[PDB]
Symmetry: C6
Subunit: 324 residues, 6 copies
RNA sequence: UCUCU
RNA sequence: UCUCU
RNA sequence: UCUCU
């Protein structure tokens, strides 16, 4: 059905302008970018609209903008549908990106020093009610860490966490980001939640894992800039870190296990993106960290993030025993 | 027999269009490959059909295509017979390879997410029937993983699995794959099942193991592309993974226990290839994990694959001595 | 507010010599730098004053100079406002920076050599008064080191130290420095003390931590050069050292536990900077050592600094649980 | 006596052709080869006949051919006696190497999957009668592994093994290959056996160890091609592996201990050469592996070969105690 | 006061020759050297007299000569006061360096094989009387090693050792060399001893540590050449070794811990400089080695020097317990 | 004495052919060397005879040749005296070095293969007589190995061995070699035996130890070439091996415990050089193995040499304390 | 397996 | 120290 | 933690 689209849009070049295409821009290492679609978890498609590095310079465009606009069929020598012109960069906001403050220049409101070491034992119904204090319109903008051993009831919980955030807070947009995960884990999570679920399977390369996470966080950063409240429910901060380890070029130093010291800064940055702004809006990131995985690498990631959050809970060792 | 077959086809220059020799495609780094026969496990010998970078673009040929076609005897400056024209692939015309859906673009239907760990109940029917549960109409297109210590009668089971499949589902395509194994264990398997067996012996280089597995998973995908149900029975992902590790370009320098982080992607991708398609066809991989071999890798490589399948079977640890 | 301030100074082209904007100097690798403001912890943003390699030779400018001067709006080909002339540094003329003694050339008076190890007597006055013993007239210009395990109320103490200094000695310049810390722990500190607080958050790169610390120790030295008494309260030399380690050019290859041997010099130099001058002024550094973080480095880096100060304070090991 | 030979053959260039010289060809990394003599265990001698890379291309010559032929004295600029012409490449077989099948194209007959874990305790007279089932005209073509700890009676056994193979099977040609071994161990073994004994002492370089083994196995490969039955009695597969480790250029990866993953493939190949052929003839390789040697490297080699053979025996721990 | 000197000597170029300057020459990696002053522990000063590599060739000058001589103000393009001419290279000895034997060509008188394992327990008054047998006009020219654990009373002892050498042997010149040491440790040691004390603080770089030690030993070597008796009291041979590790360019091999095998030779050479000469004079080096420091690196240095001396004492474990 | 001997030979230009100065040869990398004297342990000094690449071809000179010949005073452009002509080597003419059998070409007679491990019966006659068993007519040309822990009176024994040899067999050439040892232990040995002692001190570089050992084993071989019986008594193969390891070009990267695999060949070759010749002469090496020094290498290097000799002597482990 | 007044 | 119905 | 008749 992909080759059929190309023939329809090319011979329809008798009217001039009526081909609209959207997505979210990704800017690449060279300078140019692409518009990417959400349905396929932002996968590099042939029906992805190309974006010039020049329009990037024209519309102050940063990777993560929800660009909807006019396109034109590809000219010989090329491969993809270019961005012919621009219509709507976001909501009712004009093509102008020069009238709103950049995420990183917004004024943050801080909680307090106190790290909240919340209890890990109880029914998954209770534990969720503990983390949901980061989802309530009061406690938004916080960094939550869920420390999770194997077989400890994580998946069951995160679903419940996600499910109840959507059903209890339809006021704010939730993005469940899964990483390096079982395909069925994802589709179960997809059907379980009305909102947006973005994930990359274990057979996807680290190249993908990083990009797909880079996408959600910048998209988050952006929706905040429009005074919307966001929640990232990131499954496996440790797993994303592992990808970031293998993507950043070898600086020349490696800490214990095998992890480059330089590699940790990217996921750190992800976690530190969570804030509440005086200007209006919030990003709140509840991440999970895998522990005692039989890999010495994961322990280092943990011990590096150990108490960087606002609250964290170490889950249960009873569901790790009972199997109910 | 090698330097006499050349003499027949060079003397058959009077009668044009007559030489037949079906061989499955390979493609090398440059943008060209050759054709191979299944009886020899796709080995590189003298009498192989040469494929030009010429024909690859027109017929949209890709690694592991079941290519039958006409051949011309080697003109000087060459070393192999040359591909002259193209007959079929398996059913319709060669130009149909332009208008056929790519495997990666096939929409997969997704099953229930449950670990489904099974106990070592005794190497008999009770064990082989629960793997046939992945062969039964209901649960096709899944990733089976068999954990196995040294001397737990895995081959005894693995034969018995292969035999069951072959004598139960004629519509199904069995494709037993063995990597870095003893020469005798292969001969036994080759005669034990009337289906398709491809294997690389232990006295062979890493290059070969990878190549053989590549050639399978590629063929397997093509067979799915024609709405057919396919099952990979692979012996030792550990071996395959271990191979890849020495083949993959030495980069990153991040060695976690013994394996560079960039290696594990290729076996993971090989494994995650398994799926069930809504449009038609099945691909379901049963693979074994070598355990307690006393190698730093085999452990680490297992820890990486542990619980990535939709079922896992542990072949009797400590209970492997109960001789009843 | 960033692209409107440009518009004011470009329209103020009629009235010559009128634009004021005091910023403390930085110098990069080439032989040039910019000017920075203390409220933002000396960050690299758009509205910063550009310093030419031109003015650096005449006024003998060096990294961390408290420079106030006239500025001209950016001519094209640039990106920043340009430094036009020079007003003051803090007291006399800018040409006095030629005939002022260099910090490294100041003759230091030397105190009594005694380890002066103190016990964890309880986090109250009894603890904070013995650090004030390094702030009292008698024992100025010394290297204080606070050993601290996880959760020993160090910040509680560290605030209390900073507060004591600030409400006791108005003649003294407090300069609380935090490296790679949580965003909330910094805000608290910034409001807790009316003095000077500079900090880098954890979600920031190594580059930044080093840079921030550089900017402090440099400023601190200049303040001594004007016969003033200065106190550095630094949180985590461990963090600073850990940072430097990833910043410092990857050479030597000699990794003793996790840290290259060439790294530890920069934090050691930072620490040993503390001194008391016969000519006038004090520089006394209180710094904390993170312990039992379960990182191979944090240990090694402590073993290197252990007993390099003229006093060391261990904040309650195993006794940290006595909640009275 | 070496310089005396040169004067005799040079002034005897008045008749033309009557200087015959033999040996076994070694083909080198460049392309050319040399004919080498068996008396000195195939050592690079000045009285080694040079072989052109062109005759290598003319007579399908592969390293290991027992070439007997006419030679001529060296011409200025050269150093060695060249191969003037060719007479007999092997037995009564003409100069032609184009009429017989290459070793690797011969049809193998396989034993069965079952690895024969044979008992290690008893008099060396018994243990030998256990391994000699690989030397009997029925059980030929097998891979035998003798796993041997230090002081466990290996040398005493191997002699007995060798001695009885020659005295009980004069029908087939036996090659005892020793490696990295005591000089007197070798000369004792030489005088002990009527057949061919090829060895390299511990003071020989790895360069030699590999070559000398490469020679025996290719010579083996070749005699099989002439329908003769061969037995390699290789002392220390682990020791040969150690040399192969240090000869193959650094691929860029090292497994536990220090051994490159790539390095193991060569000795693997040696072991896998053993077969019985439908065409007539056999190669049977009984190798020994050293274990618990105080070197972690040897354990990896072992665990890599662990059960690659057809039968293996772990020797005795009683002669390792008694000293009789 | 440094810039004031330059104006006095430049306008005093109306008389020609009357500016005398001294020091001790350091020859650098390029070829040239500098005259350096003892008051600042041989620090690279702007008022250091430059020495041409040509005069180095004229007066057989080796790094460490106590050169006193005429100088001239710097010419444009330069930076420092050059060596205009030469007056006195040492004592009453003429400018000639061609009339006295080089240190390394002097005839040594040897003690005997017997290493004197002297007792480590007793009052520091006793222990000192044990080491002082290396300071008595009979026992001079010996290599002494003081093996010292932490908190074991080293500093207290070395002071006493030094103090009593100066007060009991004013006949010979003593150089206390401290390395990588607390600033107050040094100034306490300075005021404590009438003789020469040369040290580098812990905040000095390894660049300095090596140079400052290189200086004392060559100066030692030189005073011996003039028939004077010398004693080096080197604090921390292990600490100097650590610097030598990080200064010598990476040879490509590292022993256990992190120390390059090549790195140890320099401190070895230092220790081996101690001798008594038939020609008259002595160098005796009493060094200390740090042990059980929590760094695996220091143990290797120790075990490398273990019993290279003539006598050594392992200090006390009772002052390591009592604190008196 | 160095710059006056030059003056005598330059003034002896009137009388041609008169200057004598016997020195044993060395050869460097290029294809040239110098001449050396035995009293100074073959050191590189000013007054050494220069050997041209010219004379090396004609007289077939090789490293360690006992060369006596005429010399001419240094013409300008040089640095050393030049070799003018050649007198003798030891017996006949220099042109006889063309028609003399090379050491490596000498046919060795081989003795009985028995481990011959001896117990530590007490350091007296009973110990030194069993090493004299390798010096007695019957068992010449063997590899003796003395295992020795710290402080087991090895030197006491080693002297006693050397003394026995020297006062028993005047026909035999003793050649005591010490590597990386204390300066006093050497002087003692030099006077203790009237034979030949060559040694390198500990305060010397690896280069030197190797060089000294090279110079010995070479000389030793030449002495055998003249049908003479030679004995090497070497102190610490461990030291020699350790040296080589840092000298040998850093390649392979395969470090097994601490030593690169390419290193151990040079000491092994040094050791295996020992042999008995049918034609005439003996070469028998007694060498010591340093044990329990607490170095990762010394162990590994011993494990490599363990049981490579035809006898091994362990000097009292745990029984070294029985002081009777 | 960094919880926990 | 991979034995072993 | 290389002491020690």
């Amino acid at each position: 059905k992909q080759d059929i689209i190309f023939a329809i849009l090319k011979q329809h070049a008798k009217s001039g302008e009526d081909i609209f295409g959207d997505g979210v821009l990704e800017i690449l290492q060279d300078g140019f970018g692409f518009l990417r679609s959400a349905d396929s978890s932002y996968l590099a498609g042939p029906d992805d609209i190309y974006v010039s590095p020049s329009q990037i310079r024209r519309f102050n465009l940063r990777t993560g903008d929800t660009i909807s606009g006019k396109i034109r069929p590809p000219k010989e020598g090329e491969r993809y549908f270019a961005l012919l012109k621009v219509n709507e960069v976001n909501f009712d906001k004009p093509e102008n990106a020069r009238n709103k403050i950049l995420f990183e220049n917004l004024t943050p409101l801080h909680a307090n020093s106190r790290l909240r070491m919340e209890r890990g034992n109880g029914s998954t119904e209770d534990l969720t009610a503990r983390v949901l204090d980061l989802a309530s319109p009061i406690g938004r903008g916080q960094r939550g860490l869920i420390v999770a051993p194997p077989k400890a009831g994580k998946t069951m919980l995160l679903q419940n966490i996600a499910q109840s955030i959507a059903y209890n807070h339809p006021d704010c947009v939730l993005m469940v980001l899964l990483i390096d995960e079982r395909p069925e884990e994802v589709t179960e999570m997809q059907r379980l939640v009305k909102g947006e679920v973005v994930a990359s399977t274990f057979d996807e390369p680290a190249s993908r894992h990083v990009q797909v996470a880079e996408m959600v966080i910048e998209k988050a950063k952006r929706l905040v800039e429009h005074k919307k409240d966001v929640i990232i429910l990131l499954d496996s901060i440790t797993r994303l870190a592992r990808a970031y380890n293998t993507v950043v070029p070898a600086s020349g130093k490696v800490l214990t296990g095998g992890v480059d010291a330089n590699a940790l800064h990217r996921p750190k940055r992800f976690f530190g993106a969570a804030r509440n702004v005086e200007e209006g809006g919030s990003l709140t990131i509840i991440a999970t960290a895998l522990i005692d995985t039989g890999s010495k690498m994961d322990e280092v990631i943990y011990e590096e993030f150990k108490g960087t959050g606002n609250m964290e809970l170490h889950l249960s060792r009873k569901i790790a025993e009972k199997r109910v």
